[PDB]
A paper describes a structure:
To investigate this possibility, we generated crystals of cleaved TG3 with an inhibitor bound in the active site as a proxy for substrate. The peptidomimetic inhibitor Z-DON (where “DON” refers to the Gln-mimicking electrophilic amino acid 6-diazo-5-oxo-L-norleucine) was chosen as active site inhibitor as it showed the highest activity for TG3 among several screened inhibitors. Addition of Z-DON leads to irreversible alkylation of the active site Cys and thus captures TG3 in a conformation likely representing the substrate-bound intermediate. The data demonstrate that C1 and C2 indeed are missing from the structure. In addition to the loss of the C-terminal domains, there is also a change in a β-sheet at the C-terminal end of the catalytic core domain, comprising residues 306–322 and 395–415. The detachment of the C1 domain facilitates the binding of Z-DON to Cys273, to Asn329 and to the backbone carbonyl of Trp237—residues that before detachment all bound to C1. Four residues of the β-sheet (Gly317, Asn318, Trp410 and Asn412) have their H-bonds to the C1 domain broken. The movement of the β-sheet enables Asp310 to directly co-ordinate Ca2+ at calcium-binding site 3, replacing a water molecule. Importantly, the structure of the enzyme-substrate intermediate of TG3 without C1C2 was recognized by autoantibodies in DH patients, supporting a model where TG3-specific B cells internalize gluten peptides as part of TG3-gluten enzyme-substrate complexes.
Here, we report four X-ray crystal structures representing inactive and active conformations of human TG3 in complex with a TG3-specific Fab fragment of a DH patient derived antibody.
Residue numbers in the entry:
A (entry chain B): 1 to 223
B (entry chain C): 1 to 216
C (entry chain A): 2 to 461
The structure:
């Protein structure tokens, strides 16, 4: 069986360098082109770079050309990616892949590694600021009303959110975080409640960010 | 240079047949071989079709690939859908230098009725405006299948800059939810008559609107 | 309402059958030159007395009447000689039309358009495209092969047998020519649009496609990677890193596909039989009846003297002096066509070799060479007749090269070790035909020596 094992991933600051390695086994390494492909969290595959069997032909995605260098080493059965001048947008899972094609200059990825994670951020540990997402003036009387908390600018992950100290769980959804170009995370939590409850139940989100040892409560008040 | 365009999402019931197209933006689809990959959530991709229409050892013959010159497209067809076929699928080709991937298609194998999203669009809170920031938050819940596209409008015009959208994830009740954000300055917020969040799900669009001078 | 075309029925399946192209896997209209085909054209009305339909056919990127690569021809009631369109019947709005191409027409992909003159206006619409091949069922085409069994073998047979190894150890390998598999005819047409000949003068290259001598020799270049990024890259190193062992290919299809799909980048790796089998696909796909020839103890002569020279310093020592070698086996192709450049007596089988052994006008190309010619020692003739003479019927000389006076006298001459058991697949079976006697007079006889001599005096 083919195995590809990537390593060298980690948290790294804008402008710095990082070197990824991929060790290959269970096939004749020098017979095939090899590739790096990356995938930002919850996004698609973006091809990064290719090196031919004999290292004589190399290509790069425009988004990385001049910053990244691909290479390989026959005696070590290894592929490498030197990543210089990193940017927040280089954040992704980096996959090593073996090309399908033997003896022709066509490209497809017959085997992929599990990948190595690269996070690019200048941030230090930081607890969030929390803002209310107040329910509508209108509110749908007889029916339901959504209200929420916007949990802004924390690092690193994760944050957990509860409502009324765990007493409110029905209709709660806490969304995944987005990583901002600032290098800090944000997310939202929402709850759908009876419209007749507004101004007779208090609604408070409880945001827990264990890395910063902060808990933050925010009361959410109808408009 | 070219792009490969796939549909955002497809779905069918167990035992049925579904097709995923992959259209090449310039140059002929049959100039270069097409591959297809399956990626399950939290897993590495695996190849399911290579060289347009060949199947790797041990891929079930339920998977087939085709090329259609007349539509400049490749297709992945999956017959006899099983619940394990639920995954993201990517097409891929190349020119004599660069590798190109399609943007991916979420295949849902239907296990509950379709459900239209509920959408709520929140204006910037007064607290955030008092901190000289402004985020519009569009929250999308209770839909199935778990795939949507989101479009923002400032007044009646598209706005792309400052938008971030989350990939759908399962709620308690086993439907899906998603979020989208438009980051503005307080000056941009106050400068337009209104802003809108438009959510498309299974060919239907839901729109919600907020304005700086209304809803108090 | 002005006279226009509502729709056209090309009667594809029917015409393909009659043109003997019904076996290609393709929805295209594939046709052979010199031969009519029939279409049904459904107009918006009847033809009036004063209205004119003009057909236009063009092939290649710079087409012109004078180069014979564009033709303009009226729908007619008459017998004409060139491209022509005959109106067989009108039935209301529907016209039954018999189109023919000249037997001298360039092969290739053509476009067909119709230009209508009516009501002092002009309209022009594209009707479609077709492929036009060589026509070996047509007695006036240069590739005419009158014998039917031979034709089915050498044109329509997509599976073959190559002989291999050495005189003591003969073997044979299965080879799928696969000319009828999807995209292959199309790829073989591509090849001609990627030659040097075409890169340097497309307009004239495409005009020369009416000629199988020319098409055939371009193919001998383009099936190897040398010079032109052709299909296959040869490797005799022993080390097959970065590609396929030559012994691991089973036919041409994967080769030709891989070439096209990589954007016309060479395929790794081949040896002679792999070149010969790939060239055979190309030749059969385009209409040049062809077969695979294997030659044991094949000479590689590297200086045009009809002999393989392994030199000996006097006083009897081997020396490193020598480029001349001998292969255990070598494999090339023969194509069937008349030779208008040479004489009626030189038609029939013509050697074509896509293996890069010697350059010819500075390019790795080889042939065509009248087999009949090689046998009669007529080696002054085009093309490469000295090289190929050496291949099958070199002598092997030993010499005495004095290090000091520059004198060169012969030790021993071996006049029969070269070119043995020359072989090709039987018509209809997998038996081995010996065709040695077709390449040369009997070893150890008179005529054989007097033709070696004739040939040696034709190098000058
Ligand atoms: C047409 C070619 O490309 C021939 C290449 C040939 N390769 C093989 O023989 O491959 C093996 C095979 C097995 C199964 C099916 C198909 C192929 C080849 O390289 N042949 C030998 C060869 O002729 N060479 C290499 C340079 C010279 C040497 C040779 O032995 N020549 C002697 C004369 C012949 C034997 C008549 C000689 O002068 O000195 C000994 C090579 C040894 C494999
Ligand atoms: Ca060549
Ligand atoms: Ca010589
Ligand atoms: Ca002899």
């Amino acid at each position: 069986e083919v195995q590809l094992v990537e390593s060298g991933g980690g948290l790294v600051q804008p402008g710095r360098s990082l070197r990824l390695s991929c060790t290959a086994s269970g096939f004749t390494f020098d017979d095939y082109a090899m590739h790096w492909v990356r995938q930002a969290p919850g996004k698609g595959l973006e091809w990064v770079s290719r090196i031919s069997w004999n290292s004589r032909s190399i290509a790069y995605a425009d988004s990385v050309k001049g910053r990244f260098t691909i290479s390989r080493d026959s005696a070590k059965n290894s592929l490498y990616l030197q990543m210089n001048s990193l940017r927040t947008e280089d954040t992704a899972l980096y996959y090593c892949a073996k090309d399908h094609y033997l003896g022709s200059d066509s490209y497809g990825m017959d085997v992929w590694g599990q990948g190595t994670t690269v996070t690019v951020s200048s941030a230090s540990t930081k607890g969030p600021s929390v803002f209310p997402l107040a329910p509508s003036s209108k509110s749908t009387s007889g029916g339901t009303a959504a209200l929420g908390c916007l949990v802004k600018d924390y690092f690193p992950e994760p944050v957990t959110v509860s409502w009324n100290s765990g007493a409110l769980t029905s209709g709660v959804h806490t969304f995944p975080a987005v990583l901002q170009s600032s290098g800090l995370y944000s997310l939202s939590s929402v709850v759908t409640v009876p419209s007749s409850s507004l101004g007779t139940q208090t609604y408070i989100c409880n945001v827990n960010h264990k890395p910063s040892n902060t808990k933050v409560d925010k009361r959410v008040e109808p408009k | 240079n070219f792009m490969l365009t796939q549909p955002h999402s497809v779905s069918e019931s167990p035992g049925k047949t579904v097709t995923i197209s992959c259209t090449r933006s310039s140059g002929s689809i049959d100039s270069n071989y097409v591959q297809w990959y399956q990626q399950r959530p939290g897993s590495a991709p695996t190849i399911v079709i290579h060289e347009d229409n060949q199947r790797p050892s041990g891929v079930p013959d339920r998977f087939s690939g085709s090329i259609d010159t007349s539509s400049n497209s490749a297709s992945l067809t999956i017959s006899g859908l099983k619940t394990e076929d639920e995954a993201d699928y990517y097409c891929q080709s190349y020119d004599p230098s660069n590798v190109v991937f399609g943007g991916g298609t979420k295949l849902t194998v239907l296990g509950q009725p379709k459900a239209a999203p509920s959408v709520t669009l929140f204006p910037p809170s007064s607290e955030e405006l008092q901190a000289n920031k402004a985020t519009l938050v569009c929250l999308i819940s209770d839909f199935y299948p778990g795939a949507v596209t989101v479009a923002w409008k400032a007044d009646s015009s598209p706005v792309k800059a400052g938008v971030e959208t989350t990939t759908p994830s399962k709620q308690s009740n086993n439907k899906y939810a998603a979020s989208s954000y438009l980051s503005l300055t307080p000056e941009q917020w106050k400068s337009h008559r209104s802003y809108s969040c438009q959510v498309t799900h299974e060919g239907s669009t839901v729109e919600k609107t907020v304005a700086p001078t209304e809803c108090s | 309402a002005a006279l226009g075309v509502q729709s056209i029925n090309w009667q594809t399946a029917f015409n393909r059958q009659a043109h003997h192209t019904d076996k290609f896997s393709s929805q295209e209209l594939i046709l052979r030159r010199g031969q009519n085909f029939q279409v049904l054209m459904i107009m918006n009305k009847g033809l009036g007395s004063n209205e004119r339909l003009e057909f236009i056919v063009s092939t290649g990127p710079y087409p012109s009447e004078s180069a014979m690569t564009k033709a303009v021809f009226p729908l007619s009631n008459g017998s004409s000689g060139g491209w022509s369109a005959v109106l067989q019947a009108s039935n209301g709005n529907t016209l039954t039309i018999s189109i023919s191409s000249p037997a001298s027409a360039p092969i290739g992909r053509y476009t067909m358009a119709l230009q209508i003159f009516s009501q002092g206006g002009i309209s022009s619409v594209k009707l479609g495209t077709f492929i036009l091949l060589f026509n070996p069922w047509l007695n006036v085409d240069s590739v005419f092969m009158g014998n039917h069994a031979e034709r089915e073998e050498y044109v329509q047979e997509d599976a073959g047998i190559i002989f291999v190894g050495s005189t003591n150890r003969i073997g044979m390998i299965g080879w799928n020519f696969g000319q009828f598999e999807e995209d292959i005819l199309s790829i073989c047409l591509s090849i001609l649009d990627r030659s040097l000949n075409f890169r340097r003068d497309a307009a004239t290259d495409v005009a020369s496609r009416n000629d199988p001598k020319y098409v055939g020799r371009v193919l001998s270049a383009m099936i190897n990677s040398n010079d032109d990024n052709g299909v296959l890259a040869g490797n005799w190193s022993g080390t097959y890193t970065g590609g396929r062992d030559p012994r691991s290919w089973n036919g041409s299809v994967e080769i030709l596909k891989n070439w096209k799909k990589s954007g016309f980048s060479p395929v790794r790796y081949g040896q002679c039989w792999v070149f010969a089998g790939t060239l055979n696909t190309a030749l059969r796909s385009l209409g040049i009846p062809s077969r695979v020839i294997t030659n044991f103890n094949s000479a590689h002569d590297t200086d045009r003297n009809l002999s393989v020279d392994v030199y000996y310093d006097p006083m009897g020592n081997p020396l490193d002096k020598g480029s001349d070698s001998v292969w255990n086996f070598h494999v090339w192709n023969e194509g069937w066509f008349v030779r208008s450049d040479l004489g009626p007596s030189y038609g029939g089988w013509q050697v074509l070799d896509a293996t890069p052994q010697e350059r010819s006008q500075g390019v790795f190309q080889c042939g065509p060479a009248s087999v009949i010619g090689v046998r009669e020692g007529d080696v002054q003739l085009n093309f490469d007749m000295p090289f190929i003479f050496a291949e099958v019927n070199a002598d092997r000389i030993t010499w005495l090269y004095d290090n000091t006076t520059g004198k060169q006298w012969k030790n021993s001459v071996n006049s029969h070790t070269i070119g043995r058991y020359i072989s090709t697949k039987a018509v209809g079976s997998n038996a081995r035909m010996d065709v040695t006697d077709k390449y040369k007079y009997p070893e150890g006889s008179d005529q054989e020596r007097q033709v070696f001599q004739k040939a040696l005096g034709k190098l000058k």
